[PDB]
Design a protein around this motif. Structure first.
Motif, PDB file in Angstrom:
ATOM      1  N   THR A   1       4.472  11.545   2.680  1.00 56.17           N
ATOM      2  CA  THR A   1       4.493   9.915   2.426  1.00 56.17           C
ATOM      3  C   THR A   1       4.434   9.515   3.705  1.00 56.17           C
ATOM      4  OG1 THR A   1       6.814   9.555   1.931  1.00 56.17           O
ATOM      5  CG2 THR A   1       5.142   9.957   0.201  1.00 56.17           C
ATOM      6  N   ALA A   2       5.471   9.400   4.618  1.00 59.59           N
ATOM      7  CA  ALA A   2       5.671   8.884   5.929  1.00 59.59           C
ATOM      8  C   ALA A   2       4.373   9.194   6.713  1.00 59.59           C
ATOM      9  CB  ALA A   2       6.964   9.582   6.565  1.00 59.59           C
ATOM     10  N   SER A   3       3.980  10.355   6.810  1.00 54.88           N
ATOM     11  CA  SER A   3       2.587  10.566   7.490  1.00 54.88           C
ATOM     12  C   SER A   3       1.577   9.839   7.151  1.00 54.88           C
ATOM     13  CB  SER A   3       2.276  12.110   7.353  1.00 54.88           C
ATOM     14  OG  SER A   3       3.232  12.971   8.118  1.00 54.88           O
ATOM     15  N   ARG A   4       1.320   9.687   5.797  1.00 55.31           N
ATOM     16  CA  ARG A   4       0.192   8.779   5.437  1.00 55.31           C
ATOM     17  C   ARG A   4       0.591   7.332   5.669  1.00 55.31           C
ATOM     18  NH1 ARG A   4      -1.523  10.329  -0.742  1.00 55.31           N
ATOM     19  NH2 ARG A   4      -2.927   8.545  -0.105  1.00 55.31           N
ATOM     20  N   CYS A   5       1.830   6.972   5.546  1.00 47.24           N
ATOM     21  CA  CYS A   5       2.077   5.687   5.760  1.00 47.24           C
ATOM     22  C   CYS A   5       1.955   5.056   7.138  1.00 47.24           C
ATOM     23  CB  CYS A   5       3.424   5.270   5.208  1.00 47.24           C
ATOM     24  SG  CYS A   5       4.024   4.935   3.465  1.00 47.24           S
ATOM     25  N   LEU A   6       2.072   5.954   8.155  1.00 45.98           N
ATOM     26  CA  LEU A   6       2.259   5.414   9.472  1.00 45.98           C
ATOM     27  C   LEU A   6       0.894   5.764  10.157  1.00 45.98           C
ATOM     28  CD1 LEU A   6       5.853   6.766  10.832  1.00 45.98           C
ATOM     29  CD2 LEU A   6       5.018   4.357   9.856  1.00 45.98           C
ATOM     30  N   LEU A   7       0.428   7.155   9.823  1.00 45.69           N
ATOM     31  CA  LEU A   7      -0.771   7.632  10.342  1.00 45.69           C
ATOM     32  C   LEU A   7      -1.983   7.133   9.636  1.00 45.69           C
ATOM     33  CD1 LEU A   7       1.142   8.775  12.194  1.00 45.69           C
ATOM     34  CD2 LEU A   7       0.523  11.054  11.368  1.00 45.69           C
ATOM     35  N   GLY A   8      -2.128   6.740   8.328  1.00 46.79           N
ATOM     36  CA  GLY A   8      -3.331   6.813   7.511  1.00 46.79           C
ATOM     37  C   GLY A   8      -3.655   7.932   6.891  1.00 46.79           C
ATOM     38  N   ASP A   9      -4.741   7.815   5.966  1.00 47.16           N
ATOM     39  CA  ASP A   9      -4.945   8.899   4.871  1.00 47.16           C
ATOM     40  C   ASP A   9      -5.714  10.156   5.622  1.00 47.16           C
ATOM     41  OD1 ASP A   9      -3.531   7.940   2.984  1.00 47.16           O
ATOM     42  OD2 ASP A   9      -5.085   6.744   2.104  1.00 47.16           O
TER      43      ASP A   9
ATOM     44  N   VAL B   1       0.825  -1.296  -0.064  1.00 50.41           N
ATOM     45  CA  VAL B   1      -0.175   0.051  -0.094  1.00 50.41           C
ATOM     46  C   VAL B   1       1.014   1.217   0.054  1.00 50.41           C
ATOM     47  CG1 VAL B   1      -1.716   1.516   1.482  1.00 50.41           C
ATOM     48  CG2 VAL B   1      -1.845  -1.112   1.187  1.00 50.41           C
ATOM     49  N   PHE B   2       2.057   1.218   0.626  1.00 50.52           N
ATOM     50  CA  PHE B   2       2.885   2.331   0.677  1.00 50.52           C
ATOM     51  C   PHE B   2       3.403   2.703  -0.541  1.00 50.52           C
ATOM     52  CE2 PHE B   2       4.915   1.440   5.223  1.00 50.52           C
ATOM     53  CZ  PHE B   2       3.716   1.367   5.809  1.00 50.52           C
ATOM     54  N   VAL B   3       3.674   1.823  -1.568  1.00 48.99           N
ATOM     55  CA  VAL B   3       4.224   2.134  -2.846  1.00 48.99           C
ATOM     56  C   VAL B   3       3.216   2.901  -3.810  1.00 48.99           C
ATOM     57  CG1 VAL B   3       5.146   1.258  -5.256  1.00 48.99           C
ATOM     58  CG2 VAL B   3       5.825   0.085  -3.125  1.00 48.99           C
ATOM     59  N   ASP B   4       1.740   2.723  -3.547  1.00 53.66           N
ATOM     60  CA  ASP B   4       0.843   3.463  -3.996  1.00 53.66           C
ATOM     61  C   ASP B   4       0.766   4.896  -3.505  1.00 53.66           C
ATOM     62  OD1 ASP B   4       0.121   1.108  -5.622  1.00 53.66           O
ATOM     63  OD2 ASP B   4      -1.531   0.436  -4.085  1.00 53.66           O
ATOM     64  N   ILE B   5       1.111   5.017  -2.260  1.00 51.83           N
ATOM     65  CA  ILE B   5       1.046   6.308  -1.538  1.00 51.83           C
ATOM     66  C   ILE B   5       2.216   7.133  -2.224  1.00 51.83           C
ATOM     67  CG2 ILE B   5       1.734   7.391   0.637  1.00 51.83           C
ATOM     68  CD1 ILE B   5       0.087   5.151   2.054  1.00 51.83           C
ATOM     69  N   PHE B   6       3.419   6.540  -2.277  1.00 51.56           N
ATOM     70  CA  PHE B   6       4.526   7.349  -2.953  1.00 51.56           C
ATOM     71  C   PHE B   6       4.142   7.819  -4.386  1.00 51.56           C
ATOM     72  CE2 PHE B   6       7.135   3.836  -0.551  1.00 51.56           C
ATOM     73  CZ  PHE B   6       7.108   4.656   0.653  1.00 51.56           C
ATOM     74  N   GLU B   7       3.650   6.815  -5.163  1.00 49.35           N
ATOM     75  CA  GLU B   7       2.931   7.268  -6.558  1.00 49.35           C
ATOM     76  C   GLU B   7       1.927   8.369  -6.413  1.00 49.35           C
ATOM     77  OE1 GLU B   7       4.886   4.653  -9.401  1.00 49.35           O
ATOM     78  OE2 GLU B   7       3.656   6.218  -9.347  1.00 49.35           O
ATOM     79  N   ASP B   8       0.922   8.361  -5.465  1.00 50.56           N
ATOM     80  CA  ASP B   8       0.220   9.367  -5.291  1.00 50.56           C
ATOM     81  C   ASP B   8       0.600  10.632  -4.962  1.00 50.56           C
ATOM     82  OD1 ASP B   8      -3.061  10.032  -5.092  1.00 50.56           O
ATOM     83  OD2 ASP B   8      -2.403  10.651  -3.360  1.00 50.56           O
TER      84      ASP B   8
END
Ligand code: HEM
Ligand SMILES: O=C(O[C@H](Cn1ccnc1)c1ccc(F)cc1)c1cc(Cl)cc(Cl)c1
Length: 450
Positions: A147-155, A112-119
Motif C-alpha cells: 500500500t505504501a509503495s503504491r501510495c508514494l511511488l504510484g501504481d 486516492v490512498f483509501v481506494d488503494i487500501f481497499e484494492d
C-alpha cells in the motif's frame, strides 16, 4: 555541573549489557536511581537520558546547531544513500528533501490512498480464503509494503512487487541494519548492500519510465490526485535552483518508503491485536464502523476521518508500544538541563516508551484503555506527555498518513473478517531498530459474508 552517572560494569563497554538486555527497563530502573537526568557510557558513547515530561522542551525546541540529528543518524547512510536525509550537505537541504515526501501526502492524494487500501486488501483476501489462521505482524507488513509503495511511488511500482521480488529486497535492507550500527557505523553488511543496489536499479528504472510518461502525457502534472512523490521529485528543484540528481531522488524514495512501512505495520499489529482481544473495545470499534459505514460497502476518506474511537485505539497502542523507542540528538554546544549542564559530545536521549509508562502521566499504564485518552484526557497533563511522533521542529510529517493507513487497514479487515488472537498479547522484542511484538503473533479469522 554534570548529571549523575550510572556506574559502569566495565571501562568502555560500560552499561551496554543491561542497556542491550532491555533499554526501556534500563532507563526506568536508572531514572528511579539517579533522577530525571543521568548519563551512561555505552560502547564508548556518553549518553544522557532525559526521562520526565517536564524537562523535554529544552530537547525538542533546540535548533540543529545546538542539538544535531545528522551527527547521530548518519549511520543510515548505506540505507538511504550518500547526500540524502541525515547525510545531506546541510540541515537546510535535509529539510527540503523531507518536504518533497510531505508534498505527496496531501488531502487529494489521501482520497486516492483509501481506494488503494481497499484494492490491496481485496487482492489479499483471495490468499487468505474464507477461514484460517495467519501471522498478524506479517500480514500487516505485507499489506503495508504494497500500500505504501503504491501510495508514494504510484501504481507503476505494482508489477515490480508482484513480478520482481521488491518486497523481499526491502526485507534484506531491513535485515542488515541493527541497533549496533549506531555504535559501529562501518560494520560491513554485504547482503544489505546487495539488496540496496538492486532496489536502486529498480527505482532508477521507475524514474526513467516516468520521464517518458511525462512526455507522452503532460496533463498528469496538473492533476493533484495523480501526483505522487516520484512526480514531485522529477519536477521540483531545490529552493536555490540547484537540480536534484537521480541518486538523491532514489535515496529520498528509499527513505520515504522506509518511514512509510515498518512503523505503521507494527502499529497496526499492536492495535489490531489489542482491539480483538478486548471484548468491550471491539464492541465500541464495531459500533463506530457500522454507524460510519451505514449502507455503503467501501471506505472513503471522509468515513476514515470520523473514526475517532479507532483512532484513540491506535494512539493507545502507540503509548504502550511505540515502534521508535528512543529519540536522540548530539550536543554541539553544552546544554543546560534542570540544575545541570550536559556537555558537548554527549547524546541526548528521550524515550517514548518511558514516557508512555510514566505513572505521573498515566494510571494503570500496563492496561490498554483507549478511554484514558477519549475521556480522562490523560495525554494532555504535560505538554510532552505523549511523544510517539516526536515534537517540535522534527515532528513526524508522516503522522496523518500513518493514521489514515492503519485506520483504513484495520477498518477494512474488520469489515471482511471476524478475528480472534491466539494466546496472550506479547511483549516488545528489543532486537531491531524499529521495535515490534515478540513472535509468534497469530490469529484466526473467518469471513463475515459467505
Ligand atoms: C505510526 C507510524 C509512525 C511513527 C510512530 C513515527 C514516528 C516518528 C517520530 C518519533 C519522529 C521523530 C524522530 C526525531 O525527532 O528524531 C518522526 C519523524 C519523521 N517521520 Fe515518522 N512515524 C511514523 C510514520 C511515518 C511515515 C508513514 C512517514 C512518511 C511516509 C514518516 C516520515 C517521518 C519523517 C520524514 C520524519 C522526519 C521529520 C523531520 O526531521 O523533519 N513517518 N516519525
Ligand atoms: O525513515 C526515516 O526515519 C526513520 C524513523 N522513522 C520511521 C518513521 N518515521 C520516522 C529512521 C531514522 C533514523 C534511524 F536511525 C532509523 C530510522 C526517515 C527520516 C527522515 Cl529525516 C526522512 C525520511 Cl524520508 C525518512
Amino acid at each position: 555541573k554534570l548529571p549523575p552517572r550510572v556506574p559502569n560494569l566495565i571501562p568502555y563497554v560500560g552499561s551496554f549489557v543491561s542497556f542491550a538486555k532491555n533499554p526501556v527497563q534500563f532507563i526506568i530502573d536508572n531514572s528511579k536511581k539517579y533522577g530525571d537526568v543521568f548519563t551512561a557510557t555505552i560502547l564508548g558513547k556518553e549518553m544522557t537520558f532525559l526521562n520526565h515530561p517536564k524537562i523535554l522542551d529544552t530537547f525538542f525546541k533546540a535548533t540543529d546547531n545546538e542539538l544535531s540529528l545528522r551527527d547521530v543518524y548518519r549511520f543510515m547512510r548505506p540505507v538511504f544513500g550518500t547526500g540524502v536525509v541525515y547525510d545531506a550537505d546541510s540541515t537546510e537541504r535535509m529539510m527540503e528533501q523531507v518536504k518533497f515526501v510531505s508534498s505527496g501526502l496531501t488531502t487529494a492524494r489521501f482520497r486516492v490512498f483509501v481506494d488503494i487500501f481497499e484494492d490491496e486488501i481485496a487482492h489479499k483476501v483471495k490468499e487468505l480464503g474464507p477461514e484460517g489462521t495467519v501471522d498478524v505482524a506479517e500480514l500487516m507488513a505485507d499489506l503495508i509494503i504494497f500500500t505504501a509503495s503504491r501510495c508514494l511511488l504510484g501504481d507503476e511500482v505494482r508489477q515490480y512487487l508482484s513480478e520482481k521480488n521488491l518486497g523481499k529486497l526491502y526485507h534484506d535492507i531491513d535485515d542488515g541494519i541493527s541497533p549496533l550500527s549506531f555504535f559501529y557505523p562501518s560494520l560491513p553488511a554485504p547482503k544489505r548492500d546487495k539488496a540496496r543496489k538492486a532496489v536502486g536499479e529498480i527505482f532508477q528504472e521507475l524514474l526513467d519510465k516516468r520521464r517518458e510518461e511525462h512526455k507522452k502525457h503532460p496533463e498528469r502534472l496538473l492533476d493533484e490526485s495523480k501526483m505522487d512523490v516520484v512526480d514531485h521529485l522529477l519536477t521540483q528543484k531545490y529552493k536555490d535552483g540547484q537540480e536534484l540528481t537521480d541518486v538523491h531522488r532514489i535515496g529520498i524514495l528509499i527513505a520515504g518508503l522506509f518511514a512509510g512501512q515498518h512503523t505503521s505495520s507494527i502499529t497496526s499489529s499492536w492495535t489490531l491485536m489489542n482491539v480483538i482481544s478486548n471484548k468491550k473495545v471491539l464492541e465500541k470499534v464495531r459500533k463506530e464502523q457500522e454507524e460510519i459505514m451505514g449502507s455503503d460497502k467501501v471506505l472513503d476518506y471522509d468515513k476514515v476521518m470520523k473514526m475517532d474511537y479507532l483512532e484513540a485505539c491506535m494512539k493507545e497502542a502507540l503509548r504502550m508500544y511505540p515502534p521508535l523507542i528512543m529519540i536522540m540528538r548530539m550536543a554541539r554546544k553544552p546544554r543546560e538541563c534542570e540544575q545541570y549542564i550536559i556537555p558537548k559530545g554527549n547524546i541526548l536521549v528521550v524515550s517514548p516508551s518511558v514516557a508512555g509508562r510514566c505513572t505521573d502521566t498515566y494510571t494503570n499504564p500496563d492496561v490498554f484503555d483507549p478511554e484514558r485518552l477519549t475521556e480522562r484526557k490523560e495525554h494532555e497533563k504535560f505538554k510532552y506527555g505523549a511523544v510517539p511522533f516526536g515534537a517540535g521542529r522534527h515532528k513526524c510529517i508522516g503522522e496523518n498518513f500513518a493514521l489514515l493507513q492503519v485506520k483504513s487497514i484495520i477498518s477494512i479487515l474488520l469489515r471482511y473478517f471476524d478475528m480472534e488472537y491466539i494466546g496472550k498479547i506479547p511483549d516488545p522484542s528489543y532486537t531491531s531498530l524499529v521495535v515490534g511484538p515478540s513472535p509468534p503473533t497469530r490469529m484466526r479469522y473467518k469471513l463475515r459474508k459467505q
